[PDB]
Amino acid sequence: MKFSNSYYAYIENQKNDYPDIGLERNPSEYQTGYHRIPNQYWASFLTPKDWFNLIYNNKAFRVVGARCTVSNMIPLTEQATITTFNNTIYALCYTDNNYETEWEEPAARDLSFMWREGLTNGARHMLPTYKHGIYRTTTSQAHNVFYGWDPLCKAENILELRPGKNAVTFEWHAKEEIWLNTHMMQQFDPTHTPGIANTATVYSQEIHNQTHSNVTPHSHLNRWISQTDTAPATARHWSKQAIQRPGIMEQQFRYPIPNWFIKMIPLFDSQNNLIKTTAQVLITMELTVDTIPQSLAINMPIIDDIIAPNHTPNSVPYCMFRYQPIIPINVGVLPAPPTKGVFIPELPA
Amino acid sequence: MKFSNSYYAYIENQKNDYPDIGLERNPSEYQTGYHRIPNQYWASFLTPKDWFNLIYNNKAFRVVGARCTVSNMIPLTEQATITTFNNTIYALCYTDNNYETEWEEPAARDLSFMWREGLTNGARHMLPTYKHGIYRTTTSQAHNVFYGWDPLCKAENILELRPGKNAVTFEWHAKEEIWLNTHMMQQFDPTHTPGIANTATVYSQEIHNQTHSNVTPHSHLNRWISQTDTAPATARHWSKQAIQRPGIMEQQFRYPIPNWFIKMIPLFDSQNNLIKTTAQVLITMELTVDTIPQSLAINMPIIDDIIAPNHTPNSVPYCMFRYQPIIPINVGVLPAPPTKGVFIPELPA
Amino acid sequence: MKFSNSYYAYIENQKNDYPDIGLERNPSEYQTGYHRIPNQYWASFLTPKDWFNLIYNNKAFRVVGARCTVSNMIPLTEQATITTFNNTIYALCYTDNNYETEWEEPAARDLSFMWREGLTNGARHMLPTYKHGIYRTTTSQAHNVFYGWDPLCKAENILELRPGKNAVTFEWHAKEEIWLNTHMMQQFDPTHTPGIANTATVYSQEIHNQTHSNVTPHSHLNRWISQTDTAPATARHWSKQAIQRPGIMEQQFRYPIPNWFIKMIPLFDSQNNLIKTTAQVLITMELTVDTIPQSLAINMPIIDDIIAPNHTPNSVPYCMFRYQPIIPINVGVLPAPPTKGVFIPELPA
Amino acid sequence: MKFSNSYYAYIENQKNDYPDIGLERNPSEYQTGYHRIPNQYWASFLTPKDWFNLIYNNKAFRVVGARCTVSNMIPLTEQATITTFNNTIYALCYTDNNYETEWEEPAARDLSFMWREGLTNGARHMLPTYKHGIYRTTTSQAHNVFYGWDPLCKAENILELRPGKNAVTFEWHAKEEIWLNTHMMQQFDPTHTPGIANTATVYSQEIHNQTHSNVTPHSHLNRWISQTDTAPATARHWSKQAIQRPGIMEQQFRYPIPNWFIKMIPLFDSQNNLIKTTAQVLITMELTVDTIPQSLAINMPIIDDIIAPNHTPNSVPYCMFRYQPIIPINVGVLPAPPTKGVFIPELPA
């Protein structure tokens, strides 16, 4: 099936604070001023009804592609009194298919779909900016200042978004078929069981929450650390939960969704000061997911606990994304990221 | 190549003891009365000569498909005096390709091929019945009583076996190529060896026994537990051998052989009592295995220790299935399930 | 791209010291007298400029095939006075595509490309001979003496190299696409990071050296030991670094480069003594590697630390092969074998 | 099926020591200097794996043809210091299809297939020479000196083998279909039984050994002695085991494999002394055997006791060739030569 969700966001022309000239830092970090379209987690693509349509009555699903269309550019200027006029300026759209930029920082209650007018809970929905860091290896003596990432170095690949009835599209296609079960629990072999020998036990990834889980996990490195790092057993990373529990191999994408960058063109005046030009944009996040319909030999539908909208007075409401918790299917790969699961029945001593 | 083995077994019409109405149990288990055709292990498909033909003079093999034909239905009634007459009744044949039913419990000396007349060691060869369990996740509050598995809910997929010259076929096709070596031992890299550095050592899965080993291992969950469960190090399942040693990844099937269910139609009298109708059936278990012939540069054939028929006076005879123990081939995946292996030469301190 | 390197080496007709007739040894080892063409590591195929052309300006590469042509056979006899005459004799060329022979022992500064005249640092470049070992499993009682490897048992597959303008070619083709990044470092997920939560850290395989690293790693067994061996936790192999850190799964070849065997025909006189016939051969090692060009959005090229030629007075010079150490790409598989890596920034407590 | 085995042997140019001029002997014997290719027994054609492939899973077999290709002639001269040069000389190859030469003397552990390099257990594999004997009948007064066998008398049928890339082929085709069972034991008629009347007993040729048994027995004369010789009962030959037990009539070949003769050309110097020229030759012994596959109605394969490799410390290893010892088939001819058999059950008084 295919999900499409539109909302309004704001972008600016913050200048690229090019790599620091001062004292050298091994992870040399700087602000690029480029806004990053949120395209990593499920909540960045799906409303709760989209998630329910995805999980309900389907036994497996796989992500086929993602797409974002930025359109209806309405530029705004403030005389620091808010003029809605600009014609010549444009936005810079760049897709990092080189995967040389840092992954998106986790969003804290993005919830851009409950407030689609551009004012999320009484605050302007300004897109998050990207802060780039330059990491050289420890042994090398290269100066990081020379290796600053800049899409203008690949300006032949930069698309521009003019104001008005114009649209710039970001596109991603899955180059691998990663089918995920919609059920959070599977059976063990009676001969190869963690419970009572020659008896049936079930492991279940508990209900948890999938709004902030990556649509493309791509956590391959975590599994590789335990395979390639020859540090002694007293090393710090061996006790880290990320290294210990990397995530299912058949669940991570080799070519995940890249970072999508958009930015108003920065302009400077005679006093070497950036003149600020904000713009409203209609962001249409679209996700394509292939599904296999579910045909279980039962009378009931598996509908409860899939979504749980939580709201308390004066607190920001939110709805959790969850999988089917009722019946285990013993074929397919568990979909949820590494989280504390349970065993049914509980293991003995 | 292709293996076919026929034998006679018996089935009944035990009623489906639908989910318990009484006190709720998280693994709500009940008897479905459905007989399960043994189709999981090697001994369910292969006689010792079939196993020897499979392993001898082949360097690799892969399971292509499995098939079971149930025919020559001879129904019997007992006046609790054994009438061999029934014409209208029929059997219910259902294949669980949804993989929502528990895996087959291990067979204790099934040995249905040494006694093919229907009387295994002076006991009627009645097929094993399936006891279904309903596992919901711990957190959910769903009542398991409503989620009882029943093929009559998918009665459009139920095939029927009439008595007489009739046949119902169960079919399974491998959707993945899982090639397994016929040799139980391989070499290490001299640069990446567990023994003496820059020296040759060999790991060998010992002779063991493969009669009860799954033809399609499908033990994927065991490897996933160590990748997704974020329980603390003191958790019970971390010390379980099943979790610690899951089995070779390249050895497990993603779409293994499903459970095949057959059942006489249950009938009830005025006193609400099941009237018992037993039937003899000719079961023809068939397995297709692709093989690559072996062309080693040696003078001897690797024939010993492949099968070891054990018989002691007054004890039930049995023959063990084993792989080629003589020469290691350093390419391909070891075939045997996780079992205590040896190193040649033994590792130093 | 495609790399070709020619050099001169020497081969002899050392007789096959067939399996020992004396006291039995479980790893029964003997000298076969067959010379083994060095074809396992990068330095066996690539000069430093070839390695730099491979790594520089490429973001990924995969090994497509390897080839060795042995030609210009000039046989020599010594009257133990060095006659360069022989016409009827020939060499025996055999490829072990059965993978039943031990892997090549690590070469100690092979460096056959700096001295291509046949005299490496004032020593004749005689090809290394193969010592074959017969490993049976511990439990079996088979005599290893009967299972000696000998290509004359497959003499229908032996190619012969006549002296003069003649050539015998060894060929290997990769049957799997194993793409490797040219960068030694990748980013972590902020949500699934070993460092500060919701913050960016990088794992980096340090610079190390890749001259002696396998062009086809094929270290699958090491990862399988932790999946199939059910020995108790106090077993010797559980603390071995090879078992603990097997290497990246997506990095090992299922069908690596086999051993290539060449040997002068052995001849014996009336006193049952081998008459020694040495021959000079022109060895042309050729490797085909597919590459994807690198198009990073940076101004600098990543050129330093890729190769570091080390020379000290009166010590044999050597050049190290290394990957790109400057910029991490978060897609693809790390290329280097298991070696002590670093984290940027360093992990906290 | 078809068996091919290659190995290296040595031949010389020993002069034909033409019939003795001295005192006359009725069996006038002399050395012809012609090397005889071993082509009479099973071990001259089959490795143990070839024998196992022949006997296992086959109920009958017949010898179709035999072939020997002598090639890769490398001549050697010793200055009684071992020169590998000769171009003009050649070998003389002659096939005795007249069957006028003595049959091959039994080989004492020929075992040329375990050591195929030309040095069998630290001794040069020189081919056995043929010593011809001239037998006239007792009554006749012909001088045997005039009837010396010499292929130069039929030099139009002599093939020559030049050194280098040249090959001379010996060929034999069976002109009769002699099918032999692979089972060493058969049933008797209850009406015509040596045991209890109207009861079942089995005669079994015991396991014994078939490495030195003729591939073509051709022992017709032994059976004819008891049919044509009218000597009195006190004659010496009536108590000989060869006459008493000739061998199965349906087992002997009327046109067996003839003697194959090869010889370096003899050359003489001014002092009437033979100048010795030894040559290495690649002997490729090939045997074609038709087989009928075995389809017994049993579960086990008949694999044990077929071959028994015997090795003791410091003693030359050897493997015995044997037939199927488990199940008697009551049709076909027993394959083994006359040897002490057993009866099951044992005969009463």
Tokens matching residue A220: 């391959």
Q: How far is CA D240 from CA D225, D231, D234, D246, in A?
A: 11, 14, 12, 10
What spatial distance separates the first Cα and last Cα of chain A, rounded to whole Å? 46
Would you give the DSSP letter of residue A19? S
Contacts of A122 (CB under 8 A, 6+ apart): none
CA–CA dist D41, D211 (Å, integer): 7
Do A8 and A281 touch, CB atoms closer than 8 A?
A: yes
β-pair partners for A188: none
Minimal CA–CA distance to C263: which of C101, C117, C103, C73? C73
By the 10 Å C-beta count (0-12 exposed, 13-18 middle, 19+ buried), B22 is classed as exposed
Buried b / exposed e along C10-40 (16+ C-beta atoms within 10 A): bbbbbbbbbbbbeeeebebbbebbbbbbbbb
Q: Is the peptide bond before A345 cis (omega within 30 degrees of 0)?
A: yes
- CA–CA distance, B332 with D291 (Å, rounded to integer): 33
Which chains neighbour B (Cβ–Cβ under 8 Å, 3 or more pairs)? A, C, D
Chain C, 241 to 260: residues with Cβ < 8 Å from chain B are: 242-243, 246-247, 249, 254-256
CB distance D89 to D264 below 8 Å: yes
Residue A229 DSSP symbol: -
> Which of D307, D332, D338 lies closest to D54 in space, CA to CA?
D307
Q: Look at C297 and A151 and tell me if their CB atoms are within 8 Å.
A: yes
Contact C237 B305 (CB under 8 A): no
Find the discontinuities in chain D where C to next N exceeds 2.5 angstroms and give the residue preceding each.
80
Joined together, the tokens standing for residue A55 give 């999980």
Instruction: Give me Rg for the CA atoms of chain C.
Output: 23
3-state secondary structure of A180: strand
Residue C48 zone, left/alpha/beta (φ > 0; ψ -120 to 50; rest):
alpha
**Which A residues, 156 through 195, put their C-beta within 8 Å of a C-beta on chain C?**
none
CA distance linking residue B39 with residue B258, whole number of Å: 8
What is the C-alpha separation between C218 and A108, in angstroms, rounded? Answer: 44
Picking from A240, B7, A45, the residue whose alpha carbon sits closest to that of residue C347 is A240
C281 DSSP β-pair partners: C9
User: Looking at beta carbons, which residues of chain B come within 8 Å of C146?
Assistant: 299-300
- Where does chain A have alpha helices with state H? 48-55, 220-228, 241-244
Q: How far apart are CA A75 and CA B24, in angstroms?
A: 62
φ and ψ of A34, to 5 deg: -85, 125
CB atoms within 10 A of CB C276: 16
Q: Are C107 and C212 in contact (CB under 8 A)?
A: yes
Q: Name the amino acid, one letter, at A118.
A: G
Residue C348 CA neighbour count, 13 Å, CB half = 6
Q: Chain D residues with CB inside 8 Å of C80's CB?
A: none
E strand spans, chain D:
2-11, 27-36, 58-78, 82-83, 91-96, 129-135, 159-161, 164-173, 180-181, 185-187, 202-204, 259-264, 267-268, 274-275, 277-293, 307-310, 318-321, 342-344
Please state, in angstroms and rounded to a whole number, the distance separating the CA atoms of residues C195 and A243: 10
Q: In the numeric block, which tokens belong to residue D137?
A: 């009948």
Resolution (A): 2.9
Q: What are phi and psi of D140, to 5 degrees?
A: -65, 150
CA–CA dist A220, A226 (Å, integer): 11
Q: Which of B178, B233, B147, B143 is nearest to B61 (CA)?
A: B178
Rounded to the nearest angstrom, the gap between the alpha carbon of residue C55 and the centroid of all alpha carbons in its chain is 19
Please, do chains A and B touch (3+ CB pairs < 8 Å)? yes
**Cβ contacts of B301 on chain D, cutoff 8 Å:** 48-49, 52-53, 307
Measured CA to CA, the distance from residue A317 to residue A301 in angstroms comes to 27
Q: What does the alpha-carbon distance between residue D155 and residue A52 come to, in Å, rounded to a whole number?
A: 96
End-to-end CA distance of chain B: 46
From edge to edge, which strands make up the β-sheet containing A342-344?
A: A185-187, A202-204, A342-344
The residues, ordered by sequence, that sit 6+ positions from C141 with a Cβ below 8 Å of its Cβ are: none
Question: CB contact, 8 Å: D38 with chain B?
Answer: no
Cα–Cα distance for residue pair B251/B257, rounded to 1 Å: 14
Cα separation, B140 vs B138, whole angstroms: 6
User: Which contacts of D164-169 are long-range, i.e. CB under 8 A and separated by 24 or more positions?
Assistant: D164/C87, D164/C88, D164/D73, D165/C162, D165/D71, D165/D72, D166/D71, D166/D73, D167/D69, D167/D70, D167/D71, D168/D69, D168/D70, D168/D71, D168/D91, D168/D93, D168/D262, D169/D67, D169/D68, D169/D69, D169/D70
Chain B contact for A318 (CB, 8 A cutoff): no
Three-class SS state of A36: strand
Q: Which among A77, A70, A84 has a CA at the least distance from the CA of A159? A: A70
Angstrom distance (rounded) from CA A267 to CA A288: 38
H/E stretch holding B292: strand B277-293
CB C161 within 8 A of CB C91: yes
Please tell me whether residue A93 adopts helix, strand or coil conformation.
strand
Q: Which of A335, A262, A312 is nearest to A73 (CA)?
A: A262
Question: Could you say which DSSP state residue D165 is in?
Answer: E
Q: How many helices (H) and strands (E) does chain A have?
A: 3, 18
DSSP-based helix, strand, coil % in chain D, nearest 5: 10, 35, 55
Closest CA to C283 of C6, C3, C2: C6
Chain Cα centroid distance, residue B20? 28
Query: Which residues 6+ apart lie within 8 Å of B157 measured at CB?
Result: B94, B95, B151
User: Who contacts D176 (Cβ-Cβ below 8 Å, separation ≥6)?
Assistant: D253, D254, D255
Residues 71-130 of C with CB under 8 A from A: none
- Residue D345, preceding peptide bond in cis (omega within 30° of 0): yes
Q: C336 to chain A nearest CA, in Å? A: 8
- Whether residue A200 contacts residue A338, with contact meaning beta carbons closer than 8 Å, is answered with no
Reading phi first (left if > 0) and then psi (alpha if -120 to 50, else beta), residue D33 is in: left
SS3 of D15-56: the string is CCCCCCCCCCCCEEEEEEEEEECCCCEHHHCCCHHHHHHHHC
Whole-number Å distance between alpha carbons of A165 and A150: 28
How far, in Å, CA of C259 to CA of C106, rounded?
13
Calpha distance B112→B120 (Å, rounded)? 7
Single-letter residue type at B334: L
Q: Which of C100, C154, C228 lies closest to B341 in CB terms?
A: C228
Q: Do A207 and B242 touch (CB under 8 A)?
A: no
Give the span between the Cα atoms of C57 and C295, in whole angstroms. 8
Question: In sequence order, which residues have a C-beta less than 8 Å from that of residue B263 and are 6 or more positions away?
Answer: B11, B13, B14, B33, B34, B35, B91, B92, B93, B94
| Cα-based distances in Å from C23 to B110, C17, C19, C27, C305 | 44, 15, 11, 12, 53
Is the Cα dihedral D172, D173, D179, D181 positive or negative?
positive
Q: What is the DSSP string of B26-47?
A: SEEEEEEEEEE---SBGGGT--
Which residue of B lies nearest to A207 if distances are taken between CA atoms? B139
Give the Cα separation of B304 and C253 in Å (integer).
Answer: 31
Which residue shows structure tokens 């290497």? C247
Question: DSSP E strands: which ranges in C110-212?
Answer: 129-135, 159-161, 164-173, 180-181, 185-187, 202-204
- Give Cα A190 to chain centroid, integer Å: 38
Strand ranges for chain A from DSSP E: 2-11, 27-36, 58-78, 82-83, 91-96, 129-135, 159-161, 164-173, 180-181, 185-187, 202-204, 259-264, 267-268, 274-275, 277-293, 307-310, 318-321, 342-344
B230, two tokens: 């974020």
Both tokens of D208, joined, read: 């014994």
**Bridge-based pairing state of the strands C58-78 and C82-83:** antiparallel
Touching chains, D (3+ CB pairs < 8 A): B, C
CB A79 within 8 A of CB A61: no
C327/A136 Cα distance (integer angstroms): 6
Cα angle C23, C24, C25 (rounded to 5 degrees) comes to 120
Cα–Cα distance measured from residue B224 to residue B89, given in angstroms and rounded to the nearest whole number: 46
Q: Do strands A91-96 and A159-161 pair parallel, antiparallel, or not at all (unpaired)?
A: antiparallel
Closest-CA residue in chain B for A246?
Answer: B227
Encoded tokens for A274: 């950036």
Q: Do C269 and D10 touch (CB under 8 A)?
A: no
Contact D301 B52 (CB under 8 A): yes
The answer, yes or no, to whether A and D have at least 3 beta-carbon pairs within 8 Å is no
**CA atoms of C202 and A159, how far apart (whole Å):** 30
> What's phi and psi for B227, nearest 5 deg?
-105, -20
Give Cα separations from B32 to A321, B132, B331, D324 (angstroms).
34, 6, 45, 49
Tokens 């010079």 locate to: C317
Q: How close B254 gets to chain A, by Cα (Å)?
A: 7
Tell me whether C272 touches chain D (CB under 8 Å).
Answer: yes
Select from C126, C117, C113 the least CA-distant residue to C318: C113
DSSP string of C205-258? --S---SSSBSS---HHHHHHHHH----TT-GGGS-HHHHS---GGGS-SS-PP
Instruction: Pick the residue of A188, A191, A199, A248 with the most B CBs within 10 A to test the interface with B by mutation.
Output: A191
Contact C143, C222 (CB under 8 A): no
From chain A, the residues in CB contact with B226 under 8 A are: 245
CB contact under 8 A, C247 and A228: yes
Among C102, C146, B322, residue whose Cα is nearest residue D49 = C146
